[PDB]
């Protein structure tokens, strides 16, 4: 795929949308609407969004994602301010919370087991 | 010969109007007695204190209070103005209380914390308790009276950079390089079990609202500033992190709270931020001005002292524009004491000078000179009346606020005084040097 | 039409500067034949060495001070372009540093020559030269970090677009990918050039066109003026402001089609913000790229431009597509005319 970068809430930037070409395979602000609607809350760190183009449609592959799932559950927007030791904000996820994030991920993830899936998310959470 | 008097109130406080005429012969002590009768405050030990008639940069001194009113009427400073020479202008404000018989044997010293450093707390008034914090990773609660160590709080992983003390004196809070703040019971010397996580980097400063006037829904909280560039508000009773204030690019050196509603922060990113702590976590205003790092803060007015040696005074709460830029110090102002205290600010600087300022006017009331080296700390000891300053020159000096003259100086062969806390009765000084001892002076 | 700023020569490092002086002094001493007293001859050698030590320092430091127009002295367009890169406040302390250093080396050189000249003791005379060299050596090293900052900037100022802010310029603005770069090349008779500039994504395209024996300069803004000024950093925000000194006329291109990847609403907002600020310079708004353009957007555009109702630059838009080369010369004459015919009569 031919990939692209995005900021939360952005539309119609000259540098980012125009030279990279407007998906929909023409007519930006088609996609410019589509990305923007989806994007969620405040901009923060940039995410990938990834472009795939079809006949007169655009689709984006967007994972802020499993970690943005963590943000919703904890009710904490940041990430680990002081890496791997102890976070500055006090975002301790519960054990019950993490298996439900794992349940939902289990389609996107390969994972064999639910217990396997819990490690994979937990490894993401700690760091 | 008579005088007409015109008194207009200065600061929020008492109000009264009406000119009142008194005879000319009368002294200052008599003038206050006439004025206070009108004010409706009694002629009790309440001093009722005066400031006068705005100006005095001239060749001469301007308008002292204590000069007899007939003498003032002729010649205030000039003969006066066209609008004076007919009235005398008085600004009236309380405080203040007296302490009598000074005494003096050498202070008891309480050795502790080997060769170490940073914080001091003395609960003023009844509290005899003094709390010292150190890089040694511990804190010690001491008896101002006995001068013996009550306990040492040995929770922290590393160096203790800051502390807060409740007036009850029952609760102590500390900030450590270990990145956590802890709440302790000073009597027990027992960790509250309050270990507060969330800060990534060292917790440099904190201000605590010991008691919350507002309904119990709101409780007492402590705000902490960290190297991580963020501030957090914590519930002392239940050690939880109520809110996080993000937005500072650089480390947060100083913070003021107790505002109970306004969080004021000064950071290395040369910015001063005013915040709404409650469920929002949003910074309403960012004060821009300081060329360099903001070291110290006072929150009446908002006052910031910067490395760029300037002090800015910030106007009422919503607008975010600066009232005045106070210049004159050469170097970094370590600490300042500002308050509702007649809008009077005292600043201690590395330049080894101390200045008294009128925040409203912007005028420099006076500068205290005589210390050899940088001024580490200051307090308006007596009150409006006295200023106490500490320095490298091992000196804690007592100065006359009105005169800006130096009355007397405390220490000799030693090294230096890092900081001081003063109560009406006594002074506690944290000192450092090769042979160390905290000093407790009693008067 | 050129840069004042190019002319300053590259500053040599402290390391290069330390070695060269001593080597030169070494060369000088053996070649010289002192005449006179034995003590005097040695003294003469040492004096010579001290003076080449002074000479070599003074020559490098003078090269920084000369070559260079001072940052304040140049016209407001040019001052700005330097300001972004170094920071002017950092630059004012830095200029003074060069001056201070020069004074000190002269002062020390004078001090030592006299002392040696004065002294009888051979050991002393030798030691004195030793001391001077030691002192000279420390100074260049201390200054190395300001030398390094100065040397780096010299190269960056040389790269600056060379254009005249006095004579009439036409400015192409609009959001990115609107077709401003293409519009410009079509407009210019000769082939387009590229000028490097700090804080521009593309660079700038510069072209020029004649009507009569009057020359008109054209530059496009890509990445600089194209997007919110407030949103940008303090250095880039300042870069946007340099454009103010520079432009005699501003042209606002709109691409209604959203081929640029940006909506008409966004383009109208950016235009409106810039527009009252430059009363002094003439405006011609052109809605180019007309052939592709969609009618849905046109309604939004129409509401600012054509309507007498709120927000309007008071200029009458030309439909064209310069890229297509329909009306390319027609639009070009009008743009020049709006500022030219004006300014002539005005002055």
UniProtKB/Swiss-Prot annotation, chain A:
One of its GO terms (biological process) is translation. There is a cross-link at residue 119 (Glycyl lysine isopeptide (Lys-Gly) (interchain with G-Cter in ubiquitin)). It is found in: Cytoplasm. GO terms for molecular function: large ribosomal subunit rRNA binding; structural constituent of ribosome. Keywords: Cytoplasm, Isopeptide bond, Methylation, Phosphoprotein, Ribonucleoprotein, Ribosomal protein, RNA-binding, Ubl conjugation. The keyword Cytoplasm applies. GO terms for cellular component: cytosol; cytosolic large ribosomal subunit. The modification Phosphoserine is found at residues 14, 27. The modification N5-methylarginine is found at residue 56. Component of the large ribosomal subunit (LSU). Mature yeast ribosomes consist of a small (40S) and a large (60S) subunit. The 40S small subunit contains 1 molecule of ribosomal RNA (18S rRNA) and 33 different proteins (encoded by 57 genes). The large 60S subunit contains 3 rRNA molecules (25S, 5.8S and 5S rRNA) and 46 different proteins (encoded by 81 genes). Present with 68500 molecules/cell in log phase SD medium. There are 2 genes for uL11 in yeast. Component of the ribosome, a large ribonucleoprotein complex responsible for the synthesis of proteins in the cell. The small ribosomal subunit (SSU) binds messenger RNAs (mRNAs) and translates the encoded message by selecting cognate aminoacyl-transfer RNA (tRNA) molecules. The large subunit (LSU) contains the ribosomal catalytic site termed the peptidyl transferase center (PTC), which catalyzes the formation of peptide bonds, thereby polymerizing the amino acids delivered by tRNAs into a polypeptide chain. Belongs to the universal ribosomal protein uL11 family. This is Large ribosomal subunit protein uL11A. The gene is RPL12A.
Curated annotation (Swiss-Prot), chain B:
The keyword Hydrolase does not apply. It comes from the Eukaryota. SMART domains: WD40. GO terms for biological process: protein-RNA complex remodeling; ribosomal large subunit assembly. SUPFAM superfamilies: WD40 repeat-like. PROSITE patterns: WD_REPEATS_1, WD_REPEATS_2, WD_REPEATS_REGION. InterPro entries: G-protein_beta_WD-40_rep, NLE, WD40/YVTN_repeat-like_dom_sf, WD40_repeat_CS, WD40_repeat_dom_sf, WD40_rpt. Residues 1-96 are annotated as: Ubiquitin-like (UBL) domain. The keyword Ribosomal protein does not apply. Changing residue 85 to D: Impairs interaction with MDN1. Blocks progression of the nascent pre-60S subunit and subsequent export to the cytoplasm. It holds the Pfam family WD40. Keywords: Nucleus, Repeat, Ribosome biogenesis, WD repeat. Residues 1-99 are annotated as: Interaction with MDN1. Involved in ribosome biogenesis. Required for processing and efficient intra-nuclear transport of pre-60S ribosomal subunits. Interacts with the AAA-ATPase Midasin (MDN1/REA1), which is essential for the ATP-dependent dissociation of a group of nonribosomal factors from the pre-60S particle. Associates with the pre-60S ribosomal particle. Interacts (via WD repeats) with uL18 (RPL5). Interacts (via UBL domain) with MDN1 (via VWFA/MIDAS domain). Interacts (via WD repeats) with NSA2. Belongs to the NLE1/RSA4 family. This is Ribosome assembly protein 4.
From Swiss-Prot, chain C:
Signal peptide: none annotated. The keyword Lyase does not apply. One of its GO terms (cellular component) is cytoplasm. GTP binds at residues 174-181, 220-224, 288-291. Keywords: GTP-binding, Nucleotide-binding, Nucleus, Phosphoprotein, Ribosome biogenesis. Residues 168-340 form the OBG-type G domain. This is Nucleolar GTP-binding protein 1. It comes from Saccharomyces cerevisiae (strain ATCC 204508 / S288c) (Baker's yeast). The gene is NOG1.
């Amino acid at each position: 795929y031919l990939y692209l970068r995005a900021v939360g809430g952005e539309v119609g930037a000259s540098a980012a949308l125009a030279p990279k070409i407007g998906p929909l395979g023409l007519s930006p602000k088609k996609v410019g609407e589509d990305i923007a609607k989806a994007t969620k809350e405040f901009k923060g760190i940039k995410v990938t969004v990834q472009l795939k183009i079809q006949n007169r449609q655009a689709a984006a592959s967007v994972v802020p994602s499993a970690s943005s799932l963590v943000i919703t559950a904890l009710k904490e927007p940041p990430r680990d301010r002081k890496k791997d030791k102890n976070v500055k904000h006090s975002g301790n996820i519960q054990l019950d919370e993490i298996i439900e994030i794992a349940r939902q991920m289990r389609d996107k993830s390969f994972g064999r087991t639910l217990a396997s899936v819990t490690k994979e998310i937990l490894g993401t959470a700690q760091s | 010969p008579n005088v007409s008097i015109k008194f207009q109130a200065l600061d929020t406080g008492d109000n009264v109007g009406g000119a009142l005429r008194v005879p000319g012969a009368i002294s200052e002590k008599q003038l206050e007695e006439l004025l206070n009768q009108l004010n409706g405050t009694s002629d009790d030990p309440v001093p009722y204190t005066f400031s006068c008639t705005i100006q005095g940069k001239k060749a001469s001194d301007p308008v002292k209070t204590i000069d007899i009113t007939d003498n003032l009427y002729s010649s205030l400073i000039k003969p006066g103005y066209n609008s004076t020479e007919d009235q005398i202008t008085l600004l009236y404000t309380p405080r203040a209380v007296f302490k009598v018989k000074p005494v003096t044997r050498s202070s008891s010293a309480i050795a502790g914390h080997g060769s170490t450093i940073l914080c001091s707390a003395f609960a003023p008034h009844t509290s005899s308790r003094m709390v010292t914090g150190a890089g040694d990773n511990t804190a010690r609660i001491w008896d101002c009276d006995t001068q013996t160590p009550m306990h040492t709080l040995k929770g922290h992983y590393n160096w203790v950079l800051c502390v807060s003390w409740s007036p009850d004196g029952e609760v102590i809070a500390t900030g450590s390089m270990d990145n956590t703040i802890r709440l302790w019971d000073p009597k027990s010397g027992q960790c509250l079990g309050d270990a507060l996580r969330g800060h990534s980097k060292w917790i440099t400063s904190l201000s605590w609202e010991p008691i919350h006037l507002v309904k119990p829904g709101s409780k007492p909280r402590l705000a902490s500033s960290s190297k991580d560039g963020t501030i957090k508000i914590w519930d002392t009773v239940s050690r939880v992190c109520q809110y996080t204030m993000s937005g500072h690019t650089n480390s947060v050196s100083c913070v003021k709270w107790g505002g109970q509603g306004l969080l004021y922060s000064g950071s290395h990113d040369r910015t001063v931020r005013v915040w709404d702590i409650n469920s929002q976590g949003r910074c309403i205003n960012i004060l821009k001005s300081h060329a360099h790092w903001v070291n110290h803060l006072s929150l009446s007015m908002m006052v910031t002292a910067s490395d760029d040696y300037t002090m800015f005074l910030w106007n009422p709460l919503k607008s975010t524009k600066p009232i005045a830029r106070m210049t004159g110090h050469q170097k970094l102002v370590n600490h300042v004491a500002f308050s509702p205290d007649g809008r009077y600010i005292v600043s201690a600087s590395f330049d080894n000078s101390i200045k008294l300022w009128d925040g409203r006017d912007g005028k420099f009331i006076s500068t205290f000179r005589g210390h050899v080296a940088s001024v580490y700390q200051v307090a308006w000891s007596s009150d409006c009346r006295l200023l106490v300053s500490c320095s490298k020159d091992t000196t804690l000096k007592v100065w006359d606020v009105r005169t800006r003259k130096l009355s007397v100086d405390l220490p000799g062969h030693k090294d230096e005084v890092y900081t001081v806390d003063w109560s009406v009765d006594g002074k506690r000084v944290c000192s450092g040097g090769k042979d160390k001892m905290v000093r407790l002076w009693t008067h | 039409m050129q840069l004042s700023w190019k002319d300053i020569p590259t500053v040599a490092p402290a390391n290069d500067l330390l070695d060269i002086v001593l080597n030169r002094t070494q060369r000088k001493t053996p070649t010289v034949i002192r005449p006179g007293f034995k003590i005097t001859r040695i003294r003469a050698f040492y004096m010579r060495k001290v003076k080449y030590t002074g000479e070599g320092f003074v020559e490098k430091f003078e090269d920084i001070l000369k070559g260079f127009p001072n940052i304040n002295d140049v016209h407001p367009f040019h001052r700005d372009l330097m300001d972004t890169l170094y920071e002017k406040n950092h630059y004012k302390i830095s200029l003074a540093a060069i001056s201070r250093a020069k004074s000190l080396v002269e002062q020390v050189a004078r001090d030592y020559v006299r002392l040696l000249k004065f002294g009888q003791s051979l050991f002393q005379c030798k030691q004195l030269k030793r001391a001077a060299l030691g002192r000279m050596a420390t100074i260049v090293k201390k200054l190395r970090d300001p030398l390094a900052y100065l040397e780096q900037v010299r190269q960056h100022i040389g790269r600056l677009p060379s254009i005249d802010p006095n004579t009439r310029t036409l400015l192409i603005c609009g959001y990115p990918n609107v077709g401003k770069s293409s519009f410009l090349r079509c407009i210019t008779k000769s082939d387009v050039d590229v000028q490097p500039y700090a804080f521009t994504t593309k660079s700038l395209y510069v072209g020029h066109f004649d009507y009569k024996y009057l020359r008109f300069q054209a530059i496009d803004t890509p990445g600089i003026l194209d997007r919110p000024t407030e949103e940008m950093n303090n250095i880039e925000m300042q870069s946007i402001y340099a454009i103010a000194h520079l432009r005699s006329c501003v042209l606002y291109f709109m691409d209604l089609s959203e081929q640029c990847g940006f909506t008409i609403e966004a383009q109208v907002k950016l235009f409106h913000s810039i527009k009252p600020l430059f009363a002094n310079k003439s405006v011609m708004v052109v809605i180019n790229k007309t052939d592709i353009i969609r009618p849905e957007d046109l309604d939004e555009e129409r509401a600012q431009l054509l309507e007498s109702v709120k927000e309007v630059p008071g200029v009458e838009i030309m439909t064209s597509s310069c890229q297509l080369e329909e009306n390319v010369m027609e639009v070009r004459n009008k743009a020049c005319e709006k500022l030219l015919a004006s300014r002539i009569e005005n002055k």
